[PDB]
Amino acid sequence: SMEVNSFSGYLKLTDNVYIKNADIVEEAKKVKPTVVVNAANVYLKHGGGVAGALNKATNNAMQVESDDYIATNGPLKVGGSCVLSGHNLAKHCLHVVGPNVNKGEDIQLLKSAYENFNQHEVLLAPLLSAGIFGADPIHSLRVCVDTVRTNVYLAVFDKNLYDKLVSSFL
Numbered sequence: 001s002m003e004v005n006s007f008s009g010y011l012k013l014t015d016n017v018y019i020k021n022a023d024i025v026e027e028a029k030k031v032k033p034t035v036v037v038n039a040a041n042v043y044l045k046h047g048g049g050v051a052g053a054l055n056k057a058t059n060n061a062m063q064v065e066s067d068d069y070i071a072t073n074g075p076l077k078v079g080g081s082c083v084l085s086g087h088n089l090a091k092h093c094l095h096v097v098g099p100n101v102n103k104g105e106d107i108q109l110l111k112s113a114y115e116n117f118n119q120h121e122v123l124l125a126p127l128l129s130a131g132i133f134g135a136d137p138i139h140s141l142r143v144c145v146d147t148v149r150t151n152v153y154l155a156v157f158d159k160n161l162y163d164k165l166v167s168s169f170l
């Protein structure tokens with residue numbers, strides 16, 4: 001999609017981190033960001049969590065693009081990223097691999113994962129390594145705030161989690 005970056009309705013947590021209680025698919029469609037972040041795995045298999053939602057919204061175009069990327073380039077590393085099409089959601093999708101602590105992956109790589117955001121002026125993003133990836137979402141938000149130095153607009157879907165997360169910044 002042509003970029004518009006129509007961001008509104010966010011709470012400002014820090015100079016550069018904004019957060020909203022939102023479905024990232026519905027938010028991406030309304031914002032048309034330059035970059036939407038996917039909570040990816042190294043083979044870009046878009047199943048549970050944010051990844052399946054973004055892919056479903058593209059009617060599997062993201063998965064077919066991702067399979068072709070993997071065929072040519074092979075898998076990412078944990079903490080790594082690649083830039084692919086944003087399809088109908090964004091100009092670009094930055095597929096970022098946070099460590100999956102459910103799979104015994106090194107939580108220290110969450111810093112590396114969030115560093116990928118710093119390659120981009122502005123992003124719409126979910127929390128990395130939490131949810132199906134098994135890390136504490138409070139820790140994910142802390143690493144995001146400490147590591148991301150560019151303009152990041154966070155969407156958190158679950159209202160109860162959103163309220164608990166933002167409580168410590170109000």
Ligand SMILES: COC(=O)c1c(NC(=O)[C@@H]2CCCC[C@H]2C(=O)O)sc2c1CCCCCC2
Nearest residue numbers: 023024049050053127130131137155156157158
């Ligand atoms: C912004 O996040 C989303 O919009 C979605 C998910 N977010 C998560 O899983 C986050 C993992 C990290 C911890 C925070 C979590 C959260 O944002 O609450 S899953 C998902 C969606 C799309 C909406 C439909 C529901 C099922 C597909």
